[PDB]
Design a protein around this nucleic acid. Structure first.
Ligand SMILES: Nc1ncnc2c1ncn2[C@@H]1O[C@H](COP(=O)(O)OP(=O)(O)O)[C@@H](O)[C@H]1O
Ligand SMILES: Nc1ncnc2c1ncn2[C@@H]1O[C@H](COP(=O)(O)OP(=O)(O)O)[C@@H](O)[C@H]1O
Ligand code: ALF
Ligand code: ALF
Ligand SMILES: [K+]
Ligand SMILES: [K+]
Ligand SMILES: [K+]
Ligand SMILES: [Mg+2]
Ligand SMILES: [Mg+2]
Lengths: 442, 413
DNA sequence: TTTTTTGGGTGGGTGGGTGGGTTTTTT
């Protein structure tokens, strides 16, 4: 709404120059995604906008990076033809990639390094340009490395990522050795514009200030905050969001219908994208987990269950006001094991999980909230924070201090920091990100 | 009460000419295999009769291609000496191939292109005639490309076939670049001669007319049709046939005997001929999996069981009305349940009553046509549900073969 | 510990096949 003076000056810095790699970053709520809209309508069809999560893709009026490139939901081994499959000779995506001019990538901080490198390789190989990063496509990335770090399941996946790239962050990709990333910073908060004192407290919390932390507990710790009408609960873990959605569900007058999931092979309960014994009444707030094969709904689309029958569920979407019918999807559990004949790690399906792609959305994980502006939010701390950027994203969703509430006081012992982000954030004050070597692997 | 005149015309054409390769083709039930019996008598039993499936081999009074050349049950790579191995210096098979004059091959539509090519090569190498197709053996092929297509397993021998032949059908074999195939056509149906209206419906279904499909749906749909005694259920998929074989057994009064086998060395659970364990009850239609050295039973005759105690298998056949005893060899008794069967196992048979349980639907070219053409009268055919036009499967290769053979010749360039 | 995405037929053909894979034979 309205480009600010620092927004419009980034707009011209990024549009009227031939340099093909730009990053627009800044604290939460500075208007990065709103500047994306202004860029969306200049390039306006010459640009493909994408984001790593469904929620962030809907906020940016685009698609998930996986959905567009048709990437699988597993480790994308470096330029591996098993994972980065090239599109068909007469495919819609081939023309899409071949005529593409600009690619806008929002919430780039949550983009794991293998995902970014897969995009590079996908664009290079299909566009006939092995010598130019992203095949010659002007890439305009927007995000914040102080917000949620990428999801790296410990074990073989994390070891492959460390050995191949040194770390998981998008800025640790090797493509940045081939092209310098011009950095443009937005400072003035537009989400909390009319509450400057709250915005300043969030700035100090971004710099790990301990006295800002103790002030925050003094002002925003109210355990009853989850009960206030129309406020969303955020939570670090999925199972903590279920236990809290539980009570607002059994406070609705509708008849219960339980959708039961079928699991085959080895698929642990800890890996469930939603609950195997999932109950819903009508009028319940829900979020969708998978994109519609025919594009009537998407991953991260919010809505209200509208009528529910044995295996066919229909929900009124909040995005567009249309009633969509949700038939159950299948999830696969993937395990990576070293193959000694071909001398590489290979992914293996070991179990499956089919269930309706929905979970109640009175309480959500912080990951599904990143990108949104919320009216009010209550953060249920649960068993604690585990991800770099988790606390910050939760606290930055609202416009006003009064709109924020906490489950319990947070201590300085649970602040998390990543040395790689500190190296990145320090270097890009100079204005660009150009790497000479790769990152070391430990 | 003998051969039809067009059966005689085809007989005289393949026997009174100098041409080395012939194809007798026509719609289902036209008497192709009946003509084959005449060819066998004409060549005084010195011809060799092969067929791609055990059902077709038993129907043709011959044996499977694989059994004769001792090919393995995998892809047969082009002229590959580790897939196509010739017999030893004094093998009965070597003497058989060296003295062979005529090879009759029934249900050629189901012969996959690598099978035909392996036959060509096996006969060339063994007979030491490398520049003559089939080693100079006169080949008489009989079959129908609008019946079941050859099976391309869901490994990807499919692309090796695409890379090496461009398709699985027998007429895509490279031997047709060296020899022309003389095509003789039969038109009038003998299996449905008593029901000309039904024969004319099948003719119309053969060419895909949808007004005929609606008439078939309104006439032959009877879900209760598989519960009549004596009728055989055909299914598209193997486990669908086993799933309906078990209820007919479980509902049957009289209580079972369980047969399980012996293991030795290395054997995966479906490397065995029949399934791990087998429960049977006296008075049950089931059919055999292999022949025996003397000659009393044959792989593909079905009936009921008269007595049953653990290792003598007293069961009464239909082929003769005669008697058999089955005892296993390496290791289980080669008998499987036969209330429901795949349509692949039924191609070539003339059946008294047939019910097509469609299950999840048809998936192969010619699958529906075979199931409908087994019986003599329309009243002998029942369907579990009506057929939709979007279930008709057509391979374009078959249309170019069917079109180019209208001048009597098939060859490749 | 959080994200991304779909594979079988006891999920079921009024959900549809340009959402996409699989069935069948041969010792
Ligand atoms: N220039 C602006 N003027 C007024 N409001 C703005 C402006 N830029 C952003 N906003 C508001 O700030 C809120 C969050 O901005 P957003 O674009 O989500 O920032 P970011 O992408 O940096 O988190 C939005 O609700 C938007 O309306
Ligand atoms: N000339 C004929 N006279 C009487 N019956 C015949 C004649 N030819 C074939 N039949 C009968 O028609 C049925 C189908 O014949 P078959 O040889 O199996 O056809 P095809 O192999 O072409 O499908 C069999 O019952 C057969 O006995
Ligand atoms: F930086 Al944001 F919503 F995109 F806080
Ligand atoms: F062609 Al047939 F039975 F051999 F119909
Ligand atoms: K299907
Ligand atoms: K499906
Ligand atoms: K399906
Ligand atoms: Mg944003
Ligand atoms: Mg025949």
């Amino acid at each position: 709404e309205g480009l600010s003076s620092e927004q419009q000056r980034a707009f011209l810095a990024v549009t009227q120059t031939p340099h093909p790699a730009h990053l627009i970053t800044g604290p939460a709520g500075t208007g990065k995604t709103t500047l994306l809209y202004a860029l969306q309508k200049f390039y306006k069809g010459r640009a493909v906008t994408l984001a790593p999560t469904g929620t962030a893709a809907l906020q940016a009026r685009g698609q998930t990076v996986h959905s567009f490139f048709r990437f699988p939901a597993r480790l994308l081994r470096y330029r591996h033809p098993e994972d980065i499959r090239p599109p068909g000779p007469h495919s819609p995506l081939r023309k899409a990639i071949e005529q593409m001019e600009v690619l806008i990538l929002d919430e780039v901080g949550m983009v794991r390094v293998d995902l970014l490198e897969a995009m590079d390789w996908a664009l290079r190989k299909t566009r006939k340009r092995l010598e130019e990063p992203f095949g010659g496509v002007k890439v305009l990335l927007l995000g914040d490395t102080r917000q949620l770090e990428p999801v790296v399941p410990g074990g073989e996946e994390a070891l492959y990522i460390a050995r191949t790239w040194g770390g998981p962050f998008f800025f640790q990709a090797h493509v940045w050795e081939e092209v310098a990333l011009r950095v443009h910073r937005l400072w003035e908060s537009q989400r909390q514009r009319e509450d400057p004192l709250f915005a300043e407290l969030l700035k100090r919390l971004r710099q790990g200030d301990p006295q800002a932390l103790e002030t925050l507990n003094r002002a925003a710790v109210r355990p009853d905050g989850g009960e206030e009408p129309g406020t969303l609960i955020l939570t670090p873990r999925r199972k903590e969001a279920d236990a809290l959605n539980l009570k607002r569900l059994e406070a609705l007058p509708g008849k219960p219908l339980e959708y039961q999931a079928q699991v085959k092979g080895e698929f642990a309960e800890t890996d469930f994208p939603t609950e195997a014994a999932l109950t819903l009444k009508k009028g319940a707030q829900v979020i969708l987990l998978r994109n519609d094969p025919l594009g009537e709904y998407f991953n991260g689309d919010l809505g209200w269950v509208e009528d529910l029958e044995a295996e066919a569920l229909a929900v009124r979407l909040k995005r567009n006001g249309r009633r969509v019918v949700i038939r159950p999807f299948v999830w696969e559990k993937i395990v990576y094991t070293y193959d000694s004949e071909r001398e590489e790690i290979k992914p293996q399906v070991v179990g499956t999980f089919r269930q309706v792609p929905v979970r109640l959305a009175w309480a959500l994980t912080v990951h599904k909230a990143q990108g949104l502006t919320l009216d009010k939010v209550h953060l249920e701390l649960g068993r604690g924070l585990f991800a770099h950027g988790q606390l910050y994203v939760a606290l930055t969703r609202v416009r006003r201090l009064q709109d924020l509430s906490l489950s319990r006081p947070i201590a300085p012992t649970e602040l998390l920091w990543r040395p790689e982000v500190e190296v990145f954030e320090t270097r890009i004050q100079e204005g660009i990100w150009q790497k000479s070597h790769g990152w070391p692997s430990l």
